[PDB]
Amino acid sequence: MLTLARQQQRQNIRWLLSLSVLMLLALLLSLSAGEQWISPGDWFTPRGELFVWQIRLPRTLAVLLVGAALAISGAVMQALFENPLAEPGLLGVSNGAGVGLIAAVLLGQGQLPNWALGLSAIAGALIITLILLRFARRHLSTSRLLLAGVALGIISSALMTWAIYFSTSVDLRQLMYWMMGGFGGVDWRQSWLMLALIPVLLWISSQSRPMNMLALGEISARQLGLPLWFWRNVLVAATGWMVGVSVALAGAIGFIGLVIPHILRLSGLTDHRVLLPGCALAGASALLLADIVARLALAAAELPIGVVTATLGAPVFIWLLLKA
Amino acid sequence: MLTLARQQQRQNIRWLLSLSVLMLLALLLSLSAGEQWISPGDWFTPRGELFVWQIRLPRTLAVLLVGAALAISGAVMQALFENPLAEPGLLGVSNGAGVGLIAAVLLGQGQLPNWALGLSAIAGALIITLILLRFARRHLSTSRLLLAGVALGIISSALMTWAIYFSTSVDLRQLMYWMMGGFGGVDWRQSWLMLALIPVLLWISSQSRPMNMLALGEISARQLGLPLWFWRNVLVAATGWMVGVSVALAGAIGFIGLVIPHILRLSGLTDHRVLLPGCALAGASALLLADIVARLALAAAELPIGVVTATLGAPVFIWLLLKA
Amino acid sequence: SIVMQLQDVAESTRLGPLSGEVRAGEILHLVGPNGAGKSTLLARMAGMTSGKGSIQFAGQPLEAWSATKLALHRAYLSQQQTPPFATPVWHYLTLHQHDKTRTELLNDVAGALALDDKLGRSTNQLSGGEWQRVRLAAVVLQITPQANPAGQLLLLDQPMCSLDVAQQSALDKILSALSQQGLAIVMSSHDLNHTLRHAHRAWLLKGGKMLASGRREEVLTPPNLAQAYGMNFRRLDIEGHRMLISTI
Amino acid sequence: SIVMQLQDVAESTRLGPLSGEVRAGEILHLVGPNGAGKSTLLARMAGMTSGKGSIQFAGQPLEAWSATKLALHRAYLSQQQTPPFATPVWHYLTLHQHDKTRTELLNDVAGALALDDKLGRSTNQLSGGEWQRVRLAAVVLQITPQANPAGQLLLLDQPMCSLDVAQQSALDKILSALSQQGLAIVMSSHDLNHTLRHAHRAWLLKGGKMLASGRREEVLTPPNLAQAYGMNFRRLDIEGHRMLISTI
Ligand SMILES: Nc1ncnc2c1ncn2[C@@H]1O[C@H](COP(=O)(O)OP(=O)(O)NP(=O)(O)O)[C@@H](O)[C@H]1O
Ligand SMILES: Nc1ncnc2c1ncn2[C@@H]1O[C@H](COP(=O)(O)OP(=O)(O)NP(=O)(O)O)[C@@H](O)[C@H]1O
Ligand SMILES: CCCCCCCCCCCC[N+](C)(C)[O-]
Ligand SMILES: CCCCCCCCCCCC[N+](C)(C)[O-]
Ligand SMILES: CCCCCCCCCCCC[N+](C)(C)[O-]
Ligand SMILES: CCCCCCCCCCCC[N+](C)(C)[O-]
Ligand SMILES: [Mg+2]
Ligand SMILES: [Mg+2]
């Protein structure tokens, strides 16, 4: 090389620094925002362990995690399927978690101890992803595998919509909070899910090299020494697990794992060693903001993230393609 | 040598004959199936003149029309944006029509004379497609145009969801029938719409050549004498017109303009000279079958097409990629 | 009989300003190093691009031709093109014909490049050379004077690469015949010997600018070639073959 | 000193059954018409494909190498490849290096193919030849004996096409250098004269089968070439060049 490593490395580090600082500020923002603004001064008062410890601290944390997860999953899939519209809830995994949830309610008669439902959601996701693996191991072309996945998702939609037809315990709003996402009822009880997300997130970020190789030809990558038939399976696995836990934790969340990686690329983040971490911080920040604006935007009740997320994101999004 | 050119012609005509014959049978099917099976013999009785003339016949016709429109629109977009997931309700037009509808109810206070609502839907569709044209005329690369279009769709979603929040006449059943499609209340009163669909359908089907040219390189086509910047505009226009009338006529209908053209291609319909008419006849039958299954499947009421469509289609769909 | 005429054609720092002319029945070769800007000039000549300078084609200017009439009097072959999916050769070829009526033509022209047996095969399922021949045959059918009285120019960007010796020779015959029937043919060639043997007129280019132009034998002189490529070159004439050797 | 060894390698009706060997410091050329199946055989040799027959590389058979270990002792260059979007040259190159520590090497190797000034450009924004040189440069860097003591084989599918004369000469020097440092090199070539001048051994092929194999001088004989391509060919030798002419 000439000097390019310094120019590009320096601009990369500046980007990541900015993104992380934004995320921290969003953290303190949500840790204080709500019905009653609690300035850092009064963070240890009795109105601090209730509003800033057993309430916003785990919800905000879960938001950062799920946002990071979704955005990374986005990046990965878009690069695996070689297609712009690759989202995470596009192979049915997001819908599979739902079928698992309802299966749990109905079967369990609705007397489960809450967490049993979260576990079922993870199970639905795992089922689907495993099926997906059997469809990929057959050496099917990516073009065909994707289609097969879309189709799985289409089946699962029709499957969970039917189970809702018999359930007596069909709650009117819980459906809308589950199908547009929300962290309203998220306490430390969900701590296990938050743990289950961390390792996979870390690991998948470290994996920039093989994604930089996938960015070339299928063949150039095989030749440079990548095991495609493996990495494809791994990626689908990791993605499905992350989407699975996210849904088990907050429900079906869109927009993030579609736009957040596009926006980053449109701003010139091509390299994966900067895009993978980029996606995590931006995804986490975007979601956090959408949460801070979905819980205290309507004195009446709590909006679902699938509203505020798109409501603000897409306007801003057009503003970036329109000219920039 | 050159028996090949002719060989494929014989197989083409056999396929189209099969599809059309299937479509006729579907026609007589719905014309008789229902609450009370009216055999073709008793079609002139007073029961025939009320059930098989001002009830099933104009509803069945609309269904054939919309099904053909959706599937063709699917094929056209998938080949225009160079992408398997191109659907019709993907550039917002489907959502645009909705925004127009609601705007109509709220503004009109909810005293409109029905037909005014259809016009509103068509208006929403035109607004969007018009915008899309301004985004294309700027010489934007296909990839960028698609992304911007998806983004318009996301905005319209977030807009349409807000208007439903300030409306008294929000019926749960009517919302679900409009957002998953339905021909429940379709009389001869809707005849004008059925007309507005016909010419564009005919016209777009005659247009196989330029699409066979799009099927090669952007550049091979430009040099062979295609005006891309024109055809792109035309296609977006036609597609928007068809989707618009379709939504104004039956609501949001998915699956068809996504699966019906993929399936046709997997069975080896590559040439557009056969795929465009193929898509119309197949698209018409699939939709027609689903209506015959959504109006007499539940004694209680009428299911919405977005259920039965995916419910039967996806299982069968997987069955064709699984092995075939 | 001048079919094409270029004046002050330019494009950024990748194609300096040129001006030449293309006569009706002369095979012109565009020769020059990587970075000479042959593909650029050729694409511009094809009307695929707009920009600085102006060029006139058939007594009318390019910027005044419709993409459709233009594809009647001009056929262009880009340097690289990817084959379409599951598209049978016979179809790809017949898609370039203005007169689909003439099937005997498709058999002779496809036959010359040895595509007889392959008419029924899909294009994404060929050798590199085979596909390249398919492209060449399509573009010929699109401008063949035996079925198109409107055909005049025919641009070709390195259409000889990946073709075996025999096929190369066959194409030489084909283009020879088209040029004899009064059809301009312009193409880049990195095979100097081939230019010396088959081209009528040449255009030596370097760094975007034009170094020498004219009779192929007055252009490909060891001193000119020494400026363009940067290396000594000896001419030789054995048994009447006029080859070109390099002193490396 | 045998590095590669093929026995009864076959693949459908596009590559009949062959058996040969690849020596340690030697340049082997694959010659033959379109449809000879050079690209298929080369791909097989690279481990990109499995099928009939068995071949052994560095005392072990291919169907037993890790995708990662193989890319240490073998570098392969597919016939045609599309450049990645907005991927700067320097990045593409450094992505092929096993030892990113060595930057001098990247400058020497990229410099040889005249990529000094172009290190900062995106790869989808080059001439055809320029890109081709970028590919050639990466594959050399991946197997450069000056930074990889595991590097042995090096396959190349027609890597000379779209390269100008000068560049062709430059790559020739490089491959000669690698071959002298104990590195096998196998590649297809449609330029008989070139093979005659630079190849150690050749493998003449036709319709999938092997016609002749051995010294470049015992393989490229006018009757052999007459069987493979189907045309008379005369030999001639001036000042020590042994050229090859065709009687068309
Ligand atoms: N997309 C691009 N953007 C900017 N510069 C470009 C682009 N494509 C090519 N160039 C430059 O334009 C010049 C001419 O390219 P080109 O017209 O292909 O020359 P050429 O004679 O065809 N070389 P070659 O194809 O190897 O035989 C070169 O210096 C390229 O670097
Ligand atoms: N996808 C495919 N399906 C069927 N046959 C194929 C396919 N690809 C190539 N072939 C055939 O395989 C044979 C040899 O292919 P290939 O290995 O590219 O030969 P080649 O020596 O490289 N010819 P060339 O690239 O022109 O120098 C030819 O007869 C082709 O028709
Ligand atoms: C300003 C820095 C933010 C603090 C970082 C938060 C990490 C909290 C982890 C503690 C786990 C809480 N606990 C023990 C109840 O599980
Ligand atoms: C085979 C994997 C087994 C995973 C099951 C793990 C159960 C953890 C969930 C218990 C809930 C934690 N709790 C009770 C504090 O809420
Ligand atoms: C191929 C099937 C053709 C069916 C066409 C029947 C359409 C006639 C409709 C006329 C309606 C007149 N009206 C409104 C008084 O009923
Ligand atoms: C804006 C130009 C077109 C005008 C739109 C209205 C024309 C068709 C609507 C007529 C309604 C038909 N019908 C049967 C209800 O009377
Ligand atoms: Mg070029
Ligand atoms: Mg080849």
mmCIF file of N, CA and C in Angstrom, chain D residues 2-3 56-61 65 152:
data_model
loop_
_atom_site.group_PDB
_atom_site.id
_atom_site.type_symbol
_atom_site.label_atom_id
_atom_site.label_comp_id
_atom_site.label_asym_id
_atom_site.label_seq_id
_atom_site.Cartn_x
_atom_site.Cartn_y
_atom_site.Cartn_z
ATOM 1 N N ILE D 2 7.661 -33.823 -8.518
ATOM 2 C CA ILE D 2 6.260 -33.713 -8.931
ATOM 3 C C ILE D 2 5.345 -33.104 -7.845
ATOM 4 N N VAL D 3 4.699 -32.000 -8.217
ATOM 5 C CA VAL D 3 3.827 -31.220 -7.343
ATOM 6 C C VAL D 3 2.363 -31.589 -7.543
ATOM 7 N N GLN D 56 -3.732 -35.864 -7.128
ATOM 8 C CA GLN D 56 -2.955 -35.631 -5.928
ATOM 9 C C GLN D 56 -2.060 -34.398 -6.015
ATOM 10 N N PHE D 57 -2.070 -33.612 -4.947
ATOM 11 C CA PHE D 57 -1.318 -32.368 -4.874
ATOM 12 C C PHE D 57 -0.475 -32.333 -3.591
ATOM 13 N N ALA D 58 0.844 -32.194 -3.727
ATOM 14 C CA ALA D 58 1.772 -32.153 -2.581
ATOM 15 C C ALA D 58 1.614 -33.395 -1.681
ATOM 16 N N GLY D 59 1.667 -34.562 -2.327
ATOM 17 C CA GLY D 59 1.561 -35.869 -1.683
ATOM 18 C C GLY D 59 0.224 -36.253 -1.071
ATOM 19 N N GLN D 60 -0.787 -35.429 -1.308
ATOM 20 C CA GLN D 60 -2.107 -35.679 -0.754
ATOM 21 C C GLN D 60 -3.205 -35.470 -1.812
ATOM 22 N N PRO D 61 -4.372 -36.135 -1.660
ATOM 23 C CA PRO D 61 -5.347 -35.849 -2.718
ATOM 24 C C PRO D 61 -6.236 -34.655 -2.395
ATOM 25 N N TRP D 65 -8.111 -31.721 1.350
ATOM 26 C CA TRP D 65 -7.461 -30.480 1.737
ATOM 27 C C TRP D 65 -8.466 -29.517 2.336
ATOM 28 N N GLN D 152 3.254 -23.236 -3.957
ATOM 29 C CA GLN D 152 3.782 -24.211 -4.905
ATOM 30 C C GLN D 152 3.158 -24.148 -6.307
#
